[PDB]
């Protein structure tokens, strides 16, 4: 970066970034910590069913609570992009990681 190492980008609850996310030998996310999952859950809850963004390694995931009516503590994971090159190149791991994140959020 063209800025001092004593300065970092200001964060937002709209965009959560998890730096040291463990990777599995099959090129997938491992189990996130309980504190990480609770932070994602609480942030999605505070946004009342509207999507928040979650950065795991170098990919972006969209997460919302209110996945189903009746239970607000149900979480949905999706992803979206415009650049065809990144989708063409990463869609398989992106989808698999999205499944895993959803599974961890609801277990």
Residue numbers in the entry: 9 to 115
Task: Pull text from the paper.
Here, we show that the Salmonella Typhi STY1076/t1865 protein, named StoD, a homologue of the enteropathogenic Escherichia coli/enterohemorrhagic E. coli/Citrobacter rodentium NleG, is a T3SS effector. We suggest that StoD recognizes and ubiquitinates pre-ubiquitinated targets, thus subverting intracellular signaling by functioning as an E4 enzyme.
Therefore, residues 1–101 of the domain were expressed with an N-terminal tag in E. coli, purified to homogeneity and crystallised as native and selenomethionine derivatives. The 2.5 Å resolution crystal structure of StoD-N was subsequently determined by anomalous dispersion. The last six amino acids of the domain are disordered and not included in the structure. Despite two loop regions having higher B-factors, the four subunits of the crystallographic tetramer superimpose with an average root mean square deviation (RMSD) of 0.34 Å, indicating StoD-N has a relatively rigid structure. StoD-N has a globular α/β sandwich fold, comprising two α-helices packed against a twisted four-stranded β-sheet, with one parallel and two antiparallel β-strand interactions. Therefore, StoD-N can be defined as a new ubiquitin-like (Ubl) domain, which is striking in the context of the role of the full-length protein as an E3 ligase, which uses ubiquitin as a substrate. In both cases, these localize to a defined surface, which for StoD-N comprises the N-terminal parallel β-strands and first α-helix within the ubiquitin-like fold.
